[PDB]
Every structure is written in C-alpha cells, then in structure tokens.
Design a binder for this molecule. Structure first.
Ligand code: HEM
Ligand code: HEM
Ligand code: HEM
Ligand code: HEM
Lengths: 143, 137, 138, 145
C-alpha cells in the first residue's frame, strides 16, 4: 500500500468493532464455504446458519482472527514476518489449503461492506483488498 | 441451483429493484479498482469514476443478471450468446469471473445490509458462480 | 455437462485404460499424497507409504467410480449421488483437493498412455475430471 | 529449494529433457487445454484448432524459449525470485497475466514430462518437480505482491 492508502485503512480500522465483525466474518465463512467447518469440529453446533452465527465459540474465535488482522494493519510492509508463526500453524499443523485464506479475507471485505454502507467506498474497499491479499500471501508463505 | 437458493436469489434481486443498473456499474468500478488486472479487458473505456461507458456497461451486466434470475432453470440456453462472446471471442480468464462476482457481492452487501443474510450471501455466491460457469463453458 | 466431442474422447481414453484402471487410480492417489502432502490428512486411518494395500484398494474404488461416471456422462449427479454426499457432507473435502487429484490422474494417464494422451484427449479428460469434481462437491 | 542431493537428482533428470520438443508441447497444450490463454497470443497466427495450435511454428519457438527459462531456473533453484525478476515484470506489469495461469503452465509441463518419460518420471521425482514449478510460478507472480 502507498502511505496514503495505509492512512486510509488505518483510519477506517479505528472505527471497526472487531469482536462483532470478526464473529460475522468467521460465521459467514463457515456458512458460505461449508467445507471450512471440517477445521472447527470442536466448536459444537454448526448445523444451521443461525447456529453458526450465534455459536459463542465462533464469535470468540472470530474476535481472535480479527486481532491478528489488527496486528497486520500495523505492519503492512512486513506482513510476512507478522504472520510467520500463524503461517506455520495453519500450513504445517492444520493443513488448511491456502485458497481459503483468500476466501476469509474476501468475506471480511463483504462484512465490512455490509456494516459500513456508503462509508466503505470503492477506493477504501480496494485498499482493503490489497490488505487481505497481503495477509493471505503471508499466511501461505510456509507453503 | 437448489429451489431454496433460487428463492433467495429471486427475493434478493427483488430487493435490488430499480437499482440493478446502478449496482452493476458500481460492481464494475469496484472490480477495476480492487483488481487492476481486469482493466486490461476495457482499454477502450474511460474507467474514471462515473464514466458514461462504465455506467452503460454496468447496465448491460445487470440486465444479463436479471435475465439469469428470470431463467434459473436454463442458464446455458438463456446466456448462450453471452457465453460465446466471453469464452470464444473475448477469451476471458475464468479467474476474472470470481473477481466480478466478489465485487457484485460487496456491492449488494453494501446496499442491502438487512437483506444480505448469511444464507442469502451463500445463495448469491452460488448463483454468480453458476452464471460464471455458464459464461466460461 | 460434457460436449459430445468430450464424451467421445473420454469413453475412448477410458476404454484404452481398460483393465489397468485400478492400478492407475492407486498411482494417482500415491502421486497426490507425495506431491500435495496436505491431502494426506484426509486418510489418518491409512498407511500412505509406497505399496500400501490401503492405497491400492482405494485406487480400485476410485477407478470403479470413474468407470461408473464414464458409463453415465448424461447423469453424473444421479450416478454419483452417494459419493457426492460422502465427499461434500460427511468428509467436507475442500474443493481444491479435487483439482490436486485430477492433476495427479492426468499425470498418471499421460505416463501410461503416451500415444493416446493427445492434446485433445488431455483437454477432454481435464473437463471430465472437473465435471466429476463439481458433482462430488455439490 | 531442495537439498544439494535432491538438486543432483532433478538435475540428472532435467539433463534428458529436449526443450524444443517439450517446450512446444507444453505451451501448445496450455493453449488447447486452457483456451482463454490464447488471449495473449493473437499475433502467433493460426490457433483456430488443436492441430493448428500444436503445429504452429511460433508456438513451438516460443515454447522452446519458455523451457530455456525453466532450464535457467534449474541452475538457480535457491534464487528463483532473482532469476525470474525480469520475466515477472513482463508477465505482471506489462501483460497482466493472472498468476493462476503460471501454476497451470507449470502443471502442464509436469504432465508433458510424464507423457514423454513414462516410467522414469517416478512419483518421487514428480513431487520434487512440483516443488520446482511451484517455485517458478511464485517467483513469476512476485511483482503482484
Ligand atoms: C486471513 C486468514 C486467517 C487468519 C488471519 C487467521 C488467524 C487465526 C488466528 C489468529 C488463530 C489463533 C487464534 C488464537 O489466538 O487462539 C487461528 C486459529 C485457527 N484458524 Fe485461522 N486464520 C485465518 C484463516 C483460516 C482459515 C481459512 C481456516 C480454515 C478454513 C482457519 C482455521 C483455523 C483453525 C482451525 C484454528 C485453530 C482453532 C482451534 O484452536 O480449535 N483459519 N487463525
Ligand atoms: C457475471 C459475469 C458477467 C456478466 C453477466 C457479463 C455480462 C456482459 C454483457 C451483458 C456484455 C455485453 C454483451 C453485448 O454487447 O452483446 C458483456 C461484454 C463484455 N464483458 Fe462481460 N460479463 C461478465 C463477466 C465479465 C468478466 C469477468 C470480464 C472481464 C474481466 C468481462 C469482460 C467483458 C468485455 C471485455 C465485454 C465487451 C465490452 C464491450 O462491448 O465494449 N465480462 N459482458
Ligand atoms: C475424482 C474424484 C474422486 C473420486 C471419484 C472419489 C471416489 C471415492 C470412492 C469411490 C470412495 C469410497 C466410498 C465408499 O467406500 O463408500 C471414496 C472415499 C473417500 N474419498 Fe474420494 N474420490 C474423489 C476425490 C477425493 C478427494 C479429492 C479426497 C481428498 C483429498 C477424497 C477423500 C476420500 C476419503 C477420505 C474417503 C473415505 C476413505 C475411507 O473410508 O477409507 N476423495 N472416494
Ligand atoms: C511458469 C510460467 C511461465 C514461464 C516460465 C514463462 C516464460 C516466458 C518467457 C521465457 C518469455 C519470453 C520468451 C522470449 O524470450 O521471447 C515469455 C513471454 C510471454 N509469456 Fe510467458 N511464461 C509463463 C507463463 C505464461 C502464461 C501463463 C501466459 C499466458 C497465459 C504467458 C504469456 C506470455 C506472453 C504473451 C509472452 C510474450 C509473447 C510475445 O512475445 O508476444 N506466459 N514467457
């Protein structure tokens, strides 16, 4: 990202309720791309969209996922370093296919769009696309 | 698409109502800004915000999606001319359909936040993927 | 959804596979597991080393399913309904892994059928395996 | 990537490869199997049929050059990023080729090696070549990141 784009995403991120947004994003991933539920057997009831969205473990996990995005947002020129440990975990221990990192990033962007309306402009969304591409790339690096 | 997915798609497209052409143009703009590789398909356009060509093209895209929504049981037939154009004449890379589809979901979520439930999102995703499959066959 | 031309090429190529289909299925799995280790995590109950009888036997099952598909190209959703449920609902196989097995199958077929694996046949087999994959992930 | 021993084994196999033959075949199969890739080759003349593609002298000549770049990569397996930097600029900044296609061509090359080498292209050797073509595709895509 350029300095201007970094400033724009930094400013926007300050407005984001990460607990709410993260839970929505993770829940939507599990609903829209149901094979991803393979990785969350221990989370209990994922039987329906409503069960997924209201599942306390989904909401709690989603918050933690978005906390890692918050860390990335402070290190946009060193996402590789920032996500190195999580790359090891997701790639070497969990064996998540890296395509799914792109899918979760894109779901997050849809969620931001849903939650922010006209504030989530084409330009701001394009900046966030650069962010989520960077995060997905960093997470895939151990492949 | 499943009958439930068809229900969600028709209901969502109903909520779009008279805004479909506007949302088509916005989706193109979001695609071009987010995914600059896609701009090379439209070197003949002015791609600046609010351009007449993007507005007009967005209306065409929306009209094809409306046609799809009205012919969900026969997309291959209904979109035959558009499939030939995209796959044979224009040689559009299949990846780019994913990028436009995502751009359309972002647009719909932005404008229909109450109606864009997780289930509706899933159904619209499958719809746009089905349209994309037809246009790349 | 295959074209007539693709159906013809698939039936002809699979005919040439003949009584080696199980062998090729087993080799394709072996190549998938070695080249794409993420896929191994779907088979915790298997020994996945070269010459494993479990990989051999599973290759014969995969071959039987592909043969059934070749014999029902006009109704893959129907013919593969049990396998679709198993892979999509029970096993939750990531769609990407169907690409990885499909590639592994093409490598295997090219190795064994170098005269028959023409560019056109390669293209038809690619579309066949993509169509099977779509059905099994629906 | 690869250990020194593993590099010796892939180098030995690669020594057998006829790049004119294999390169032309790989590029032609890309254009036949994944026909959208023809978008980038309008100047190559007749791509109207599979036979036209495979027998097109420009496709064969270009494929040889593509395989020469793989041969260069095979000599610099610990610095694919640097080795492919100029080609990354060409494919990403100038042509805007979607990087998914770099993976597709690498996998076509693997299929072509299998077709041409049969028994000798073992599962073990193929797996190491999968690492190589992934590395080449990643290096070529670097200008997008
Ligand atoms: C942008 C993409 C992603 C980010 C930033 C991310 C981040 C995280 C973080 C930060 C954790 C650790 C939470 C903690 O502190 O305990 C985690 C755990 C995990 N992630 Fe992800 N993740 C991503 C994508 C995915 C995807 C796509 C999947 C699977 C489809 C996945 C599956 C998991 C699993 C299974 C765990 C461990 C859950 C458990 O402990 O039971 N992640 N992820
Ligand atoms: C849901 C997916 C899509 C739909 C419904 C769609 C629809 C359309 C329609 C209705 C037209 C006009 C046809 C005509 O004039 O007869 C068109 C033209 C075109 N589309 Fe698409 N399209 C889709 C995806 C794409 C993608 C992904 C690209 C490239 C990134 C693309 C590139 C083009 C181009 C280059 C033209 C011709 C432009 C021109 O006439 O000036 N389309 N599309
Ligand atoms: C062309 C694609 C595929 C075909 C035709 C196919 C076919 C089969 C068949 C016939 C069975 C046995 C079902 C039974 O015993 O009732 C099966 C089981 C299975 N498949 Fe697949 N499969 C395909 C792709 C995949 C992929 C991509 C994976 C994962 C990477 C996978 C993982 C499994 C697993 C884990 C089982 C169950 C194993 C067991 O019970 O021992 N399959 N498949
Ligand atoms: C691993 C993947 C690839 C490698 C190693 C590669 C390598 C090369 C090389 C070495 C050249 C320059 C040849 C010369 O000296 O003139 C080249 C040019 C080119 N490549 Fe690739 N390439 C790859 C993938 C692709 C793909 C997937 C496409 C399109 C779908 C593509 C399209 C082109 C085009 C259009 C040119 C220029 C052709 C011209 O001169 O008109 N390449 N590539």
């Amino acid at each position: 990202l350029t300095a201007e784009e970094k400033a724009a995403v930094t400013a926007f991120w300050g407005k984001v309720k990460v607990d709410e947004v993260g839970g929505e994003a993770l829940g939507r991933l599990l609903v829209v791309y149901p094979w991803t539920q393979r990785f969350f057997e221990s989370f209990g009831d994922l039987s329906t969209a409503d069960a997924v969205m209201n599942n306390p473990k989904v909401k709690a996990h989603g918050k933690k996922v978005l906390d890692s995005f918050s860390n990335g947002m402070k290190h946009l020129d060193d996402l590789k370093g920032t996500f190195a440990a999580l790359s090891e975990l997701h790639c070497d221990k969990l064996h998540v296919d890296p395509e799914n990192f792109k899918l979760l990033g894109n779901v997050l962007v849809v969620v931001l769009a849903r939650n922010f309306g006209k504030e989530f402009t084409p330009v701001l969304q394009a900046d966030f696309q650069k962010v989520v591409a960077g995060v997905a790339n960093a997470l895939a690096h151990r492949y | 698409l499943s009958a439930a997915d068809k229900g969600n798609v028709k209901a969502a497209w109903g909520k779009v109502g008279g805004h479909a052409a506007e949302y088509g143009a916005e989706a193109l703009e979001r695609m071009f800004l987010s995914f600059p590789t896609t701009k090379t398909y439209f070197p003949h356009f002015d791609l600046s915000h609010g351009s007449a060509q993007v507005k007009g093209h967005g209306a065409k895209v929306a009209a094809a999606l409306t046609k799809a929504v009205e012919h969900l049981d026969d997309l291959p037939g209904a979109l035959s001319e558009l499939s030939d154009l995209h796959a044979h004449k224009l040689r559009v890379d299949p990846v780019n359909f994913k990028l436009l589809s995502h751009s359309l979901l972002v647009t719909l979520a932005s404008h229909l936040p109450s109606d864009f439930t997780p289930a509706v999102h899933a159904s619209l995703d499958k719809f746009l993927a089905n349209v994309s499959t037809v246009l790349t066959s």
